[PDB]
A paper describes a structure:
Aerolysin is a major contributor to the pathogenicity of Aeromonas spp, which causes gastroenteritis, deep wound infections and sepsis in humans. It is a pore-forming toxin (PFT), which is secreted by the bacterium as a water-soluble protein, binds receptors on their target cell membrane and, following proteolytic activation, forms circular heptameric oligomers that insert into the plasma membrane thus permeabilizing it, potentially leading to cell death. Aerolysin belongs to the family of β-PFTs, meaning that the final pore spans the membrane in the form of a β-barrel and defines the aerolysin-like family of proteins that share a common structural motif3. Combined, these structures, consistent with the recent lysenin pore structure, describe the major steps involved in the pore-formation process by aerolysin: the transition from the monomer to the oligomer with the formation of two highly stable concentric β-barrels, the zipper-like formation of the β-barrel and the final piston-like puncturing of the lipid bilayer.
Numbering used by the authors:
A (entry chain G), B (entry chain A): 1 to 424
The structure:
């Protein structure tokens, strides 16, 4: 070992270490690491062979592992399938109002409602579906409720069965918008004509019988650039980031524009940066004459149609009630209890609300304090649990667009005019 | 003297200063420095010769040292074997989830369970082993308990002996991950094509009858570089360091990237540094003409597949109970007491929890306030205590991987174009 995932084991009944094409003896230590699961796969006084002269006896023997043999055996498996919940393509939401965005998510039956509905069903929630359909997740009503949204089982009309009404409700609560730097795209980039920032004019006077070319005029240092940014459609007010994001090098010019973290995107609509550029002129004015000189400095603006994407998080809540003799809550309650459990879709917050955390720790009995994902596998089949959860946890991503402009270019002229004979 | 280690002494009984091939007279001062141990090696009224006309009388004489002689003697030893607990090769743990890492350690029977089990046994703990084995440390059950792990004696099945059940449990508690700079390794290093950061364009105008080559355009100073780092597999959130770690000079470029101490590795996923590079152009424009000039600045990224190792600490706890007439607790209690003593594996914290501290001070009776390591040597043999403790205290080391990238290269172009005859 090397972790043992319960769902990869089965039972042979053909003799002394049967085994198969892709199946090898579970040893003593391996069994013990998850014997609380293995023992649940056999009858009270059922005895089966483990490996190397060791056997596992059922519940009537307290699950005890001892030396001996049997015709039943746990010669499983081979290089195990350890597929963690697969990732899927991001769900691109057409940059709208914060509310528009949320509305689109809760009404997307093909990517949100049915996937989530099946999750509830698999966990053991009762009545996940409306009175006009025989299928889970169909005939659901979407409605808004305060700061969240509710997907409810459509109790209109008649109904047969223990406890029609009190149908499992899926509530969508908190949202967060995390801007992802690497999603930066842009449209056609424009550029303005060179603008004259400033000039300086001077005269050099050589009132003598020799050139004496020893003098100068210089400009240097700052100099400054302007940065402006717009927000196309509202959402920006709730958009934040956890890292010191900087603007990408579009075209052929890099600007030192850093975006502050933990601030609304809409709160940083511009700024000012500096740079440097010096220029000098050193004339060779001929004897008895004057020469005019100029130093000129130019700008030029560039502009983008920018777009970023932000990851959208969800808080989900599943209302009661748990089905009798058929739910995944680790205690396996049979009192038809009202539940209300929450999940965080996206970033890790704690163990209880993290589907991935729990899924990834299925091999450790001591961590099973919430939902028994091993049970859900045994009931529905590993690959269906993987696909369902993959859809539930896919990465919803919302667009953020606007305009960008900046004084990015610099140019300079140094001009020396013709000599003018004195008088000065 | 020069410390005397009790375990290096024995007793001769052949006459007036017997001695041997590798054995020489213990003198008065030497004996006194550890007479509380030496006296325990003789009967109440047993008398033996020390050296130089001095003898040591047993417990009935209060261990008194006086002038005289005897046929017994303590002519021991020679250049003593003072082997401190040897160090062993680090145990490399395949960079996983914080929990994955811990799980691998507690299930490593060949490097953790049996070594630790023997430690408990040697100290005097009772029942270190399961009901299906006759050997210490075999048939142990591993289970998780809250923030720690428990290794327990497998009380399933029957059992004979005074107090079956209440078997010594080994608990593993706190962990800490200390990143070690010197473990830095990396994979294939990549490098990008030169990217254009910026340019500046200017014109020099010489409207005169002579070249007057006296002017310039310059760029200088900052300039900045970006540093990005990723975290492959979770653990990074708990990884810290006690020193101002800086990144190694990979390839041919040194970057001034300093990692803050006492912060999670995962909290420092990037940064920004600066450097400098200036460029100047000083044209020699011919009479009555113009020349265009450019100054260009370039970047280029490099990237690593990096790996560091972190030392893993442990807090160990050994539950009761101490064996009658056979334990190492310095008072030698015989009331079958429940114990619960803890040890810190790794860094020094105090005397009580430091195995190395205590081992290294065996020669000083006044420091024996916890475990009597001299007793454990007398019972098991020095070399077995050394090997066992070496395994217990070997240095577990966990991997930390991720990606690294940075704007490390710089290049620049200075271009002077061909002259263009006026008009300007």
């Amino acid at each position: 070992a090397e972790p043992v995932y319960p769902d990869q084991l089965r039972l042979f009944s053909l003799g002394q270490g049967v085994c198969g094409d892709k199946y090898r003896p579970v040893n003593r230590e391996e069994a013990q690491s998850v014997k609380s699961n293995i023992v649940g796969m056999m009858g009270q006084w059922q005895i089966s062979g483990l490996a190397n002269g060791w056997v596992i006896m059922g519940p009537g023997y307290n699950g005890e592992i001892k030396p001996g043999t049997a015709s039943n055996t746990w010669c499983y498996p081979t290089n195990p399938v350890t597929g963690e919940i697969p990732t899927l393509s991001a769900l691109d939401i057409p940059d709208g109002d914060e509310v528009d965005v949320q509305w689109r998510l809760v009404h997307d039956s093909a990517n949100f409602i049915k996937p989530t509905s099946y999750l509830a069903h698999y966990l053991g929630y009762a009545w996940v579906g409306g009175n006009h359909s025989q299928y889970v997740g169909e005939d659901m009503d979407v409605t808004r409720d305060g700061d969240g949204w509710v997907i409810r089982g459509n109790n209109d009309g008649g109904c047969d069965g223990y406890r029609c009404g009190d149908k499992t409700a899926i509530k969508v609560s908190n949202f967060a918008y995390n801007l992802d730097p690497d999603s930066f795209k842009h449209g056609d980039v424009t550029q303005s004509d060179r603008q004259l920032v400033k000039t300086v004019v001077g005269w050099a006077v050589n009132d003598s019988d020799t050139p004496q070319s020893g003098y100068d005029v210089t400009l240097r240092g700052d100099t400054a650039t302007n940065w402006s940014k717009t927000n196309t459609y509202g959402l920006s007010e709730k958009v934040t980031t956890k890292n010191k994001f900087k603007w990408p090098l579009v075209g052929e010019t890099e600007l030192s524009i850093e975006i502050a973290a933990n601030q609304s995107w809409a709160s940083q609509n511009g700024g000012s940066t500096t740079t440097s550029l010096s220029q000098s002129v050193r004339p060779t004015v001929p004897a008895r004459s004057k020469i005019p000189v100029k130093i000129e400095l130019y700008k030029a603006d560039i502009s983008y149609p920018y777009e970023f994407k932000a990851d959208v998080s969800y808080d989900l809540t599943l209302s009661g009630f748990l089905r009798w003799g058929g739910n995944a809550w680790y205690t396996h309650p049979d009192n038809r209890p009202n539940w209300n459990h929450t999940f965080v879709i996206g970033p890790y917050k704690d163990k209880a609300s993290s589907i991935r955390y729990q899924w990834d720790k299925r091999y450790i009995p001591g961590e099973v304090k919430w939902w028994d994902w091993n049970w859900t596998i045994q009931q529905n089949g590993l690959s269906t649990m993987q696909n369902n959860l993959a859809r539930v946890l896919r990465p919803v991503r919302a667009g953020i667009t606007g305009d960008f402009s900046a004084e990015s270019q610099f140019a300079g002229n140094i001009e020396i005019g013709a000599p003018v004979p004195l008088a000065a």
